[PDB]
Design a protein around this ligand. Structure first.
Ligand SMILES: Nc1ncnc2c1ncn2[C@@H]1O[C@H](COP(=O)(O)OP(=O)(O)O)[C@@H](O)[C@H]1O
Ligand SMILES: [Ca+2]
Ligand SMILES: [Ca+2]
Ligand SMILES: [Ca+2]
Lengths: 165, 359
């Protein structure tokens, strides 16, 4: 799980932020921290130094009100993947715009601004008589021929066969 | 070329390409027999054919017929050469160890795919909702599960099963039409009880209330135009049919109802996560598609749980496809290439690789 951002995630104490761009996890320029597109989903990692020398992790995925389903779903999966690269030690948090945790809001000293837009998605009669009805149903018999375009199933084993060695 | 996503349910195959926002193909998972036919064809021919469902209650049972289905999916429906596509598959919760291995083995051995992965359905649905934590109610054609998930992972000990599903709702719809004097038991008509189900049925906030509203008023009635032009009337049956989900006893079940099984699933989990589940209850699979079910389940859970509990049912309109969509996203991620079981790892480790790479 070799992603160049995963190598960086959670090394030093501090605040890392990525945006979901087209099924990818992309670093957000550090100048732009705190300004979220509300058409987008973000992944945020707070690394705090414990007094025991260990690193404390808090993994926030932030769903803009207009983010497309691929980006919010990607956000959450990346959150799980990142926790899992960090030995399951992160606490995972779902942050929806307008509903953020005080904790998450605490990371932005000047304070987080929203703003519109973002990156495009990675997706591309009378009495009922049955004999009248039932007649229709059995009235299509010689009508439907088979499909003629197909590759019938032989049972062909195309792959190499793993020997129980 | 591109990754494939196959979500095999009991009544419908949902097949397509990773990265699309929907499956390119959806057809009945069935094999008919008088040679054989599959999927659409057989569905249309069944009056002449013996039908078989190779997956029963979300578990694969007949493996020869499941191969035939997978074959048809690749060549006839998706029209692809499977050796060229990594293929993601999906599985029921608690899928036996043995079915998992067989799935794996068939894919690499019968179909020769270069890579493959298998993923827990309820979990893909939770992801498609953009959550790592929540409790999923997955109710398909042939079976209904509650699956509590925490930080990305299902908790098996708390998974709750119900063998009552959309197929049974059809059957129960069948009979209340006959009792009201419309009799379709015949497989040609079978679709019609199914199609009536999908369209006029809905779930009532208060069951008995809607029943008195029913026989005192006629205002809840609706009618349906059949293919022969005929026109029939439908009563409380609209909302009697889905009511069996909360009141299994209508079909005789002593089993508890979906509100109860949700609740029993939540309470089997650890105390410190019960809040996150109560607040995230995600509905997925066609049998959850009924109007008024979300408002219902809410009120039943708003009842059965502590007065402080913040409660939400998430019922996204596309949820018929949620499982398939979670798959498409998963399979699209840049971080996903190493997650696959490659042909090389299969042929070193054999099929037992599925337990260590997929869980
Ligand atoms: N609009 C609808 N309203 C109610 N039920 C529906 C609707 N559409 C489909 N269903 C039912 O949902 C079930 C199939 O859903 P699906 O999740 O594809 O099943 P599986 O994944 O179990 O094969 C069927 O029982 C079908 O009758
Ligand atoms: Ca976007
Ligand atoms: Ca964790
Ligand atoms: Ca299903």
């Amino acid at each position: 799980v070799e992603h160049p951002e995963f190598l960086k995630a959670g090394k030093e104490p501090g605040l890392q932020i990525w945006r979901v761009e087209k099924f990818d996890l992309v670093p957000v320029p550090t100048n732009l921290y705190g300004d979220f597109f509300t058409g987008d989903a973000y992944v945020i990692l707070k690394t705090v130094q414990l007094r025991n020398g260990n690193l404390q992790y808090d993994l926030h995925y932030w769903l803009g009100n207009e983010c497309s389903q691929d980006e919010s779903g990607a956000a959450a999966i990346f959150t799980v993947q990142l926790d899992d690269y960090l030995n399951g030690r992160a606490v995972q948090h779902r942050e929806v715009q307008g509903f953020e945790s005080a904790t998450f809001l605490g990371y932005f000293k000047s304070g987080l601004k929203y703003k519109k837009g973002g990156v495009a998605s990675g997706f591309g009669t009378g009495p009922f008589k049955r004999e009248e009805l039932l007649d229709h149903l059995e009235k299509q018999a010689k009508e439907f021929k088979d499909r003629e375009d197909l590759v019938p199933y032989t049972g062909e084993k195309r792959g190499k066969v793993w020997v129980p060695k | 070329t591109t990754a494939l996503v196959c979500d095999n349910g009991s009544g419908l195959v949902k097949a397509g390409f990773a990265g699309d926002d929907a499956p390119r193909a959806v057809f009945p998972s069935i094999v008919g027999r008088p040679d054989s036919y599959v999927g659409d064809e057989a569905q249309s021919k069944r009056g002449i054919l013996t039908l078989k469902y190779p997956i029963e209650h979300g578990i694969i049972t007949n493996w020869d017929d499941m191969e035939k289905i997978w074959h048809h999916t690749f060549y006839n429906e998706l029209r692809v050469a499977p050796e060229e596509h990594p293929t993601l598959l999906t599985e029921a919760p608690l899928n036996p160890k043995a079915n998992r291995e067989k799935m794996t083995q068939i894919m690499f051995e019968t179909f020769n795919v270069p890579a493959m992965y298998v993923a827990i359905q309820a979990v893909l649905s939770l992801y498609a909702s953009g959550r790592t934590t929540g409790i999923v109610l997955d109710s398909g054609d042939g079976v209904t599960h509650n699956v509590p998930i925490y930080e990305g992972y299902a908790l098996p000990h708390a998974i709750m099963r119900l063998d009552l599903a959309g197929r049974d709702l059809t059957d129960y719809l069948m009979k209340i039409l006959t009792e009201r004097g419309y009799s379709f038991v015949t497989t040609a008509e079978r679709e019609i009880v199914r199609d009536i189900k999908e369209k006029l049925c809905y779930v009532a906030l208060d069951f008995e209330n809607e029943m008195a509203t029913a026989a005192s008023s006629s205002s809840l009635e609706k009618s349906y135009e059949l293919p022969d032009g005929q026109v029939i009337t439908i009563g409380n049956e609209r909302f009697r049919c889905p009511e069996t989900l909360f009141q299994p006893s209508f079909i005789g079940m002593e089993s508890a109802g979906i509100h109860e099984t949700t609740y029993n699933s939540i309470m089997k989990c650890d105390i410190d996560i019960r809040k996150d589940l109560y607040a995230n209850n995600v509905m997925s699979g066609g049998t959850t598609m009924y109007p008024g079910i979300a408002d219902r389940m809410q009120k039943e859970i708003t009842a059965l749980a502590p007065s402080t509990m913040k409660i939400k049912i998430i019922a996204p309109p596309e949820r018929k496809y949620s499982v398939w969509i979670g798959g498409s996203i998963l399979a699209s991620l840049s971080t996903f290439q190493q997650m696959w079981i490659t042909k090389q790892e299969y042929d070193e480790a054999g099929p037992s690789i599925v337990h260590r790479k997929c869980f």
